[PDB]
Structure formats: C-alpha cells, structure tokens
Design a protein around this ligand. Structure first.
Ligand code: HEM
Length: 291
C-alpha cells in the first residue's frame, strides 16, 4: 500500500503559514473552552488520534487520508470528545478549502504545540484525502487501563521505540481527562495549556494513590489534585521507561528535541515523500511575527 505525498496545487510555504496563522489566531480568541484551558490540547490530541491508527504492517490508517472525516472513524468511541476539535477547525477549512483534511488535522496539532510554547515541529504537506472505504476500523487506538508491557507492544505497531514512546506520552502535560469522555477525570499537572516537562517531574515527585473514580475506573491521584492513567503510571514501573522519565525530568531541552522528532515521525508515518518534494516547513509563531 503506497501513499505518495502530493503538494496541493501551486501552494507553497506562505500558503501554509497563512493556515497556521488562522489556526493560531482562533486559539488565541476562543480562550474560554474547557474552563479556559482553550483548544490547544484537544487539537494535539486530534493530531495524534488521526495518526495513531497507523499499522506499519500493511500501511493502513495513519494521517494521510484524513479518514477521521468519515462517520466510522468520527464515531470511534476512542475518539470521544474530539468532535470539539473538528468543529474548531471547520471554519478554517471553509476559509482555506484547498487544504486536504489530513494536512489540516496534522497542522492543527503542530500549531497548538508551538503556540503553547512547545518546540518547533517541522511539518510536511502533501497528504491526500482518500475515500470512505479506506477508513480504518475502530479499535487501533490504545487502552488506558493496561501496563508497561501493553504500552511497549502497542507502540511497536507504530514503529516507535521506548524513548519515542516516553517523549510522546509526556506530551507537555496538556489539557485533562474528562469523565464523560473516557471514564477518567482530572489533569496531569498545573500548567495544562503550556507545553512543559512537568509530567515527568510530577510522576517522580508526587505522592500517588491508587483510587477508583466515579466511572468506577482506577486512576492514580495526587494530593496536589493531579492524576495519572495506569498507562501513564506504568512508565515508572518499567525499569527502561523509568530511566528515560528521569532523563527528561532533568533535561527540558533534550525532552523538547526528542518530542519534536517523534511527533513529526508520528505525523508522517505511512507517507511516501518524492525526492523532489519540498523540505519540511518550520512555521513562525504569532509571537515571533508580532501578530
Ligand atoms: C498509551 C497511550 C495513551 C493513552 C491510553 C491515552 C489516553 C488518554 C485518555 C484516556 C485521555 C482523556 C480524554 C478525555 O477524557 O477527554 C487522553 C487525553 C489526551 N491525550 Fe492521550 N493517551 C495516550 C497517548 C497520547 C499521546 C501519544 C498524545 C499525544 C502526543 C496524547 C495526547 C493527549 C492530550 C493532549 C489529551 C488531552 C485532551 C483534552 O484536554 O481534551 N495522548 N489521553
């Protein structure tokens, strides 16, 4: 199964930077969503979920085809809550109808991370919408009530290694869990709309207690008011994971670099880029533009 990247006709960096800006501007302006956390976290979660369906074995799923727009994937119970990010983007798509769904869902994720003060994520255009019959079946996204062995094995299907998995989960510590969405409730940290390495620090320094939530699911709770999923907490139970958690807790910059590499890889999995494709774009932030 091959998916060759095809740049939207005649567009270049400036076209995409325009789309970035529009996304960043609306992020700034629609600030009250989810008790003033804003739409940043739900957007990087959308980018991860549309990419996280990939299967390295037959090159199905992945961000290329933008199949999240089809009802099968849109109604995947694992995607509960993501409709709010879709609806955020919808007006922008209307304004820039030439961009493909896959490119818009993934750039939404790049934009959010950069605007939340995370690292720069190089990004490549060229994703092409594929038909409804190419929509992956529900069930390729990971469960939260499992252990380290599960996490390691799961991510192998996405060609991610231990260091990649740990950088990816740490993910700036953004947004929160919502009981009506996932059966889990609460945030990972105090800065839920600033990209930081706090997840690792919190993991290692908080006093966690294993409790049952109102959805009758177990989660790890801290006196600070934070929570960890069993899959999150398993990162300090596994000896390989734990050393990497400790390294990112002690080195912000290393974490930033490592995440940037892994997120881009995640967003590009399954995509073939022709030798003559343009180099990756690095978008400037509103801040760097004085906007
Ligand atoms: C073993 C892997 C992971 C599991 C099982 C998982 C599970 C969870 C679940 C249960 C939530 C709560 C959703 C809600 O109630 O609204 C959540 C939210 C979130 N996850 Fe993950 N996830 C994992 C990996 C990732 C990774 C790789 C990223 C992205 C780089 C990511 C980004 C997010 C973010 C930003 C949200 C917050 C969304 C918001 O605030 O609405 N997750 N995750």
């Amino acid at each position: 199964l091959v998916h060759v990247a095809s740049v939207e006709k005649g567009r270049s960096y400036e076209d995409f930077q325009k789309v970035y800006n529009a996304i960043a501007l609306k992020l700034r302006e629609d600030d009250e969503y989810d008790n003033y956390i804003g739409y940043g976290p739900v957007l990087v979660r959308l980018a991860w979920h549309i990419s996280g369906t990939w299967d390295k074995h037959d090159n199905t799923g992945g961000s290329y085809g933008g199949t999240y727009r089809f009802k099968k994937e849109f109604n995947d119970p694992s995607n509960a809550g993501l409709q709010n990010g879709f609806k955020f983007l919808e007006p922008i798509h209307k304004e820039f109808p030439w961009i493909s769904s896959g490119d818009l869902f993934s750039l939404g994720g790049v934009t959010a991370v950069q605007e939340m003060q995370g690292p720069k994520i190089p990004w490549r255009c060229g994703r092409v919408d594929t038909p409804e019959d190419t929509t992956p079946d529900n069930g390729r996204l990971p469960d939260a009530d499992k252990d380290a062995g599960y996490v390691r094995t799961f991510f192998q299907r996405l060609n991610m290694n231990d260091r990649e998995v740990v950088a990816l989960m740490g993910a700036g510590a953004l947004g929160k869990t919502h009981l009506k969405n996932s059966g889990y409730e609460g945030p990972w940290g105090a800065a839920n709309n600033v990209f930081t390495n706090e997840f690792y620090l919190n993991l290692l320094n908080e006093d966690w207690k294993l409790e049952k939530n109102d959805a009758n699911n177990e989660q790890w709770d801290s006196k600070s008011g934070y929570m960890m999923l069993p899959t999150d907490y398993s990162l300090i139970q596994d000896p390989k994971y734990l050393s990497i958690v400790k390294e990112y807790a002690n080195d912000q910059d290393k974490f930033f670099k490592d995440f940037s590499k892994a997120f881009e890889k995640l967003l590009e999995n399954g995509i073939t880029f022709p030798k003559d494709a343009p180099s990756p774009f690095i978008f400037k932030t509103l801040e760097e533009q004085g906007l």
